[PDB]
From a paper:
Omicron (B.1.1.529), the most heavily mutated SARS-CoV-2 variant so far, is highly resistant to neutralizing antibodies, raising concerns about the effectiveness of antibody therapies and vaccines. Omicron is the most heavily mutated variant to emerge so far, with more than 30 mutations in its spike (S) protein, 15 of which occur in the receptor binding domain (RBD). To delineate the structural basis for antibody-mediated neutralization, we determined the cryo-electron microscopy (cryo-EM) structure of a prefusion-stabilized Omicron S trimer in complex with representative Fab fragments. The two highly potent antibodies against Omicron (XGv347 and XGv289, with IC50 values of 0.006 and 0.016 μg ml−1, respectively), one monoclonal antibody (XGv282 with IC50 of 0.268 μg ml−1) with intermediate neutralizing activities against Omicron, but high neutralizing activities against the other four VOCs, and a monoclonal antibody (XGv265 with IC50 of 7.479 μg ml−1) with more than 500-fold decreased neutralization against Omicron, but potent neutralization against four other VOCs were selected for structural investigations.
The strauctures of XGv347–Omicron S structures revealed three distinct conformational states: three XGv347 Fabs bound to a completely closed S with three RBDs in the down state; two XGv347 Fabs bound to RBD in either two up or one up and one down configuration. XGv347 bound to an epitope at the tip of the RBD, largely overlapping with the patch targeted by ACE2. Unexpectedly, the epitopes of XGv347, A23-58.1 as well as their sister neutralizing antibodies would be normally inaccessible for the RBD-down conformation in the WT S, but become accessible for either up or down RBDs in the Omicron S owing to a markedly outward expansion and clockwise rotation of approximately 10º of three RBDs, leading to an approximately 9 Å conformational movement of the receptor-binding motif (RBM). The XGv347 paratope comprised 5 CDRs with heavy chain and light chain contributing 70% and 30% of the binding surface area, respectively. Structural superimpositions and competitive BLI assays reveal that XGv347 and either XGv289 or XGv265 can simultaneously bind to S, informing strategies to rationally design two-antibody combinations for potential therapeutics.
Numbering used by the authors:
A (entry chain I): 1 to 107
B (entry chain A): 14 to 68, 75 to 240
C (entry chain B): 343 to 587
D (entry chain G): 1 to 123
E (entry chain C): 441 to 489
The structure:
């Protein structure tokens, strides 16, 4: 029973440019339990940022997580060619995850 | 709990002599019609003794304990209700406590919070109970507690024609303490002092406390 | 009724005669391994203090309480010191402890930040901070109870039957002893040469019936030369004079 | 390597029972690690089928996922048997089992590993 | 041995002591209790090695 709103829904930027995304949850505010995942079309998904404070193995330096309020922001240093996938942001503390529609970056 | 009764009506000391009291069995194993020379610690014969009284009148002064000591007292009701044995007796070190107050004997080795003038017998107006059960409030760590079954004890307060006379004596050898007690009944000797005579004794208790004791103070009420 | 493994109850026994012959006739008693002394010579030692711990463990982890061993239940709830003195007594109890509907009256800890010293009664219900970030309040992600409960069913076979185990550890001559076992009393021979050990008296000489008048606590008999010439026989008030033939 | 192995695509019919098994090579379910299951449709929003703990036995599911789906955890094989019943035409999607590397040492607040799942289609 | 050398043994159970420089070599079945535990080891009957 969680409503997730991700913006912008669509991105039209030149390749290699810096990108920013934000998202919000209608449930109770959690500052340390937000994670960003990417799923490839027809391939296994991969995590990007876990806990909004650190990266996992193989995570590029482009992905950065920030946010003081309910909104959580993910910044990408450059539109890397194989990073053009669909983004999802998920909480952990609240009710079982109701995954959002998904923010996908493409040219 | 206690009350600062104070009002010490002290009287000058008097003289007394320990004629021949305090000869015990060192190890009673069947010596028959012989003369045996033993070496132990005893009261030297004809040892001097300082005397004080309590009658209104009430004295509970402080007297240091020193390497084996005789004490004596006269009643018919066991008016005195406690005896401390320690080295500082200011709620800082474990102290022995021997009580023969109402019906049963109590021994406790603990760091008692001794009152200034502790009592256990104050109750209007001449009848008494075991009011103010504890004269101590400090108990940090102490294990040597025992409750010894009644010996020949006294009932009701009696004044005149004294028939009960208690002497204690205190032996200490580098931690091994021993208490010898004679609670003698049927003594027709009212006026002055201990009876002159001989009587075989037995060490009331041997005990390895292993602590340091050098002082005490009398507890009667 | 027994306490849990982590919440083990310690009962201290002292100042008595400890007879292990009336205890060795237990029916389901099979686990027995003593290291400090031989089990057959447990009746001739005097003990300063004796305390026992009673707890119920699974059939598979019965030997996990043995000294020098490690395991999921033997490292977080209760353990024995490596220089464990004495030996434990364990017996299978599948008729009383096991419940048809499932027994869930005991807890075992599988999660801990570190280990615990043997012979420790310290335990708490503090949650296990499995996650990197601090976890408090309620359970979230990577936040689970460090303890789990027994699941005992009568349909279970070996490896899950509850065992009622008592641990008998003790100090050895660290103080004037309080607990001693039964002592040998091997008859008595009269009017005949015999070696004797009457409460610590050693000598040689026939034992004869004597009628001297001792006193309530007079045991020995001493002569002019300071040698024994009379002894009070233990377990009796009889007095016997010791002389050659 | 840190990889998850699973069966290939499956085609089935409504009114049956489906058992799905996925294993992990180089990764174990241990006592702390807890896995979860997701369903991915043709570019649609994901849904959390449920997550279970192998060791503590904690059971959690979505409100609509408490009558036809079950996860059974096997520690000996370190697997999660997924039982599905009364399958409908909306189950034509890819099922993924995901667990993070959290084995008694350290882990983060997210799911690390991700298997290829099974492309299950029910007609 | 790192894996464990279980070829070295010792005794713990004997009916009575032995004279100086005496051997035993062999190991009979020991019955500890009054009841004769014939056969193999178990209750009041054990392996003295
Ligand atoms: C038991 O306590 C007494 C204290 O009353 C100790 O007596 C002290 O002895 C030292 C020896 O040099 C003196 O310097 C102190 O002045 C003494 N104390 C007092 C209050 O006079 C006694 O030594 C203790 N027993 C032992 C064995 O140490
Ligand atoms: C039994 C006991 O407590 N003994 C202690 C020990 O330090 C010593 O015997 C004494 C001082 O010599 O002080 C006390
Ligand atoms: C062969 C033989 O009987 N030898 C005896 C035996 O009783 C004893 O055990 C042995 C050394 O232990 O020496 C002697
Ligand atoms: C050297 C020798 O013969 N020793 C024997 C031993 O072999 C045997 O086991 C024992 C009886 O149990 O008597 C002794
Ligand atoms: C006497 O008074 C002092 C302080 O005035 C107090 O510390 C002490 O406990 C009192 N003693 C009794 C027996 O009431
Ligand atoms: C002993 O006591 C008497 C009085 O009873 C006194 O005169 C004498 O000086 C005392 N002697 C010692 C050594 O204390």
């Amino acid at each position: 029973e969680i409503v997730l709103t991700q913006s912008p829904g669509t991105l039209s930027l030149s390749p290699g440019d810096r990108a920013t995304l934000s998202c919000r949850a209608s449930q109770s505010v959690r500052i340390s339990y937000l994670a960003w995942y990417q799923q490839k079309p027809g391939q296994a998904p991969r995590l990007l940022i876990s806990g909004s404070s650190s990266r996992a193995t193989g995570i590029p330096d482009r992905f950065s997580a920030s946010g003081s309020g309910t909104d959580f922001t993910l910044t990408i240093s450059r539109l890397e060619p194989e990073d053009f996938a669909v983004y999802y942001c998920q909480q952990y503390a609240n009710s079982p995850w109701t995954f959002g529609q998904g923010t996908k970056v493409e040219v | 709990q206690c009350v600062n009764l104070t009002t010490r009506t002290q009287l000058p000391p008097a003289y007394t002599n320990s004629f021949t009291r305090g000869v015990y069995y060192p190890d009673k194993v069947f010596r028959s019609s012989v003369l045996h020379s033993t070496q132990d610690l005893f009261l030297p014969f004809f040892s001097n003794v300082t005397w004080f009284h309590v009658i209104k009148r009430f004295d509970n002064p402080v007297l240091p304990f020193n390497d084996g000591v005789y004490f004596a007292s006269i009643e018919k009701s066991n008016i005195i209700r406690g005896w401390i044995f320690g080295t500082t007796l200011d709620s800082k070190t474990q102290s022995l406590l021997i009580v023969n107050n109402a019906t049963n004997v109590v021994i406790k080795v603990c760091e008692f919070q001794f009152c200034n003038d502790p009592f256990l017998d104050h109750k209007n107006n001449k009848s008494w109970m075991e009011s103010e059960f504890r004269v101590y409030s400090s108990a940090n760590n102490c294990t040597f507690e025992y409750v010894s079954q009644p010996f020949l004890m006294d009932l009701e307060g009696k004044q005149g024609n004294f028939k009960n006379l208690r002497e204690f004596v205190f032996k200490n050898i580098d931690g091994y303490f021993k208490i010898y007690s004679k609670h003698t009944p049927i003594l027709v000797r009212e006026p002055e002092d201990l009876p002159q005579g001989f009587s075989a004794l037995e060490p009331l208790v041997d005990l390895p406390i292993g602590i340091n004791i050098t002082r005490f103070q009398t507890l009667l009420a | 009724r027994f306490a849990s493994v982590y919440a083990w109850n310690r009962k201290r026994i002292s100042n008595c005669v400890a007879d292990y012959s009336v205890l060795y006739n237990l029916a389901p008693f099979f686990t027995f391994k003593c290291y400090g002394v031989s089990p057959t010579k447990l009746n001739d030692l005097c003990f300063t203090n004796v305390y026992a711990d009673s707890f119920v463990i699974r059939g598979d982890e019965v030997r996990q309480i043995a000294p020098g061993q490690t395991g999921n239940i033997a490292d977080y709830n209760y353990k024995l010191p490596d220089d464990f003195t004495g030996c434990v007594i364990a017996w299978n109890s599948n008729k009383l402890d096991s419940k048809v509907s499932g027994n869930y009256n005991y807890l075992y800890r599988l999660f801990r930040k570190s280990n615990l010293k043997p012979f420790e009664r310290d335990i708490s219900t503090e949650i296990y901070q499995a996650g990197n970030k601090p976890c408090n309040g309620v359970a979230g992600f990577n936040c689970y109870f460090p303890l789990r409960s027994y699941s005992f069913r009568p349909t279970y076979g070996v490896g899950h039957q509850p065992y009622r185990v008592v641990v008998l550890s003790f100090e050895l001559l660290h103080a004037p002893a309080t607990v001693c076992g039964p002592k040998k009393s091997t008859n008595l021979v009269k009017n005949k040469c015999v070696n004797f050990n009457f409460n610590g008296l050693k000598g040689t000489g026939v034992l004869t019936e004597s009628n001297k008048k001792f006193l309530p606590f007079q045991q020995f008999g001493r002569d002019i030369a300071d040698t024994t010439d009379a002894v009070r026989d233990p377990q009796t008030l009889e007095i016997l004079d010791i002389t050659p033939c | 390597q840190m990889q998850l192995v699973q069966s290939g695509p499956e085609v089935k019919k409504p009114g049956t029972s489906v058992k799905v098994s996925c294993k992990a090579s180089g990764f174990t379910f241990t006592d702390v690690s807890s896995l979860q299951w997701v369903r991915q449709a043709r570019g649609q929003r994901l849904e959390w089928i449920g997550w279970t703990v192998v060791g503590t036995g904690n059971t959690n599911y979505a409100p609509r996922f408490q009558e036809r789906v079950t996860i059974t955890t096997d520690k000996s094989t370190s697997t999660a048997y997924m039982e599905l019943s009364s399958l409908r035409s909306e189950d034509t999607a890819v099922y993924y089992c995901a667990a993070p590397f959290c084995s008694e040492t350290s882990c983060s607040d997210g799911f690390d590993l991700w298997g290829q799942g099974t492309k299950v289609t029910v007609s």
